[PDB]
């Protein structure tokens, strides 16, 4: 209901496909060696790459550029982790052939990640598959995660919501025409928002586990995660 939602819906979403991962990168998941070193390198190559397109996407969100600039940073540094997660779940659940699902998983398991963090991560990776989310549901959820006023180091959180709320209502509108036999779908998607938080907690520890054993990052990643 209300295209004025669709003036931004479709608009949200040629932003979403506008860039995929370069296959100079994604075809290294196959062409290169399988060591905990190379495993970690590719993941870095891919997360860093994914930060770049993420920024591009975020900038094209209605009213984001209009925001305080001390918050535009805070929005990204807290949600980048979780946004990465969403876009790879998409990759694994739909089992997209450009993401190389079955192989990408194994690079991750031997990347020096504690099995303590490995496990709940694929508990999710599956968990989000059965929802069989549409791209609009993967896209809107990604924009909503970015536009999250509950992150840390935000001064004007009210303005952030003034831009999240439409896309929420657009999302809310969506789960009543695609799937109507169950009204409770819209707030099962919203539960994944909280699981990602639970993972954003675990991830900061994966980071230190890595930085501890000498695993290094890009200046971009080292900056978005300090």
């Amino acid at each position: 209901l209300t295209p004025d939602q669709q003036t931004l819906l479709h608009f949200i979403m040629d932003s979403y496909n506008k860039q995929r991962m370069p296959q100079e990168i994604t075809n290294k998941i196959l062409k290169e060696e399988f060591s905990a070193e190379e495993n970690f390198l590719i993941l870095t190559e891919m997360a860093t790459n994914h930060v770049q397109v993420l920024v591009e996407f975020t900038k094209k969100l209605p009213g984001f550029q209009t925001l305080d600039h001390e918050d535009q940073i805070a929005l990204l540094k807290g949600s980048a982790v979780e946004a990465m997660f969403l876009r790879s779940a998409e990759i694994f659940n739909k089992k997209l052939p450009s993401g190389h699902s079955d192989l990408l998983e194994e690079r991750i398991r031997n990347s020096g990640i504690s099995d303590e963090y490995i496990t709940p991560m694929f508990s999710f990776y599956k968990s989000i598959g059965e929802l069989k989310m549409t791209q609009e549901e993967y896209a809107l959820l990604t924009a909503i995660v970015i536009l999250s006023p509950d992150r840390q180091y935000i001064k004007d959180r009210e303005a952030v919501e003034k831009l999240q709320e439409p896309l929420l209502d657009v999302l809310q509108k969506l789960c009543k025409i695609h799937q109507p036999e169950n009204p409770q779908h819209f707030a099962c998607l919203l539960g994944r928002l909280t699981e990602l938080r639970t993972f954003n907690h675990h991830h900061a520890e994966m980071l230190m586990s890595w930085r501890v054993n000498d695993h290094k990052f890009t200046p971009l990643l080292c900056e978005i995660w300090d």
Binding site: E56, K77, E223
Partner: peptide, 11 residues
């Protein structure tokens, strides 16, 4: 501090 991020938002 946090200036690599600002160059991607102004492109």
């Amino acid at each position: 501090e946090n200036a690599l991020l600002r160059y991607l938002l102004d492109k």
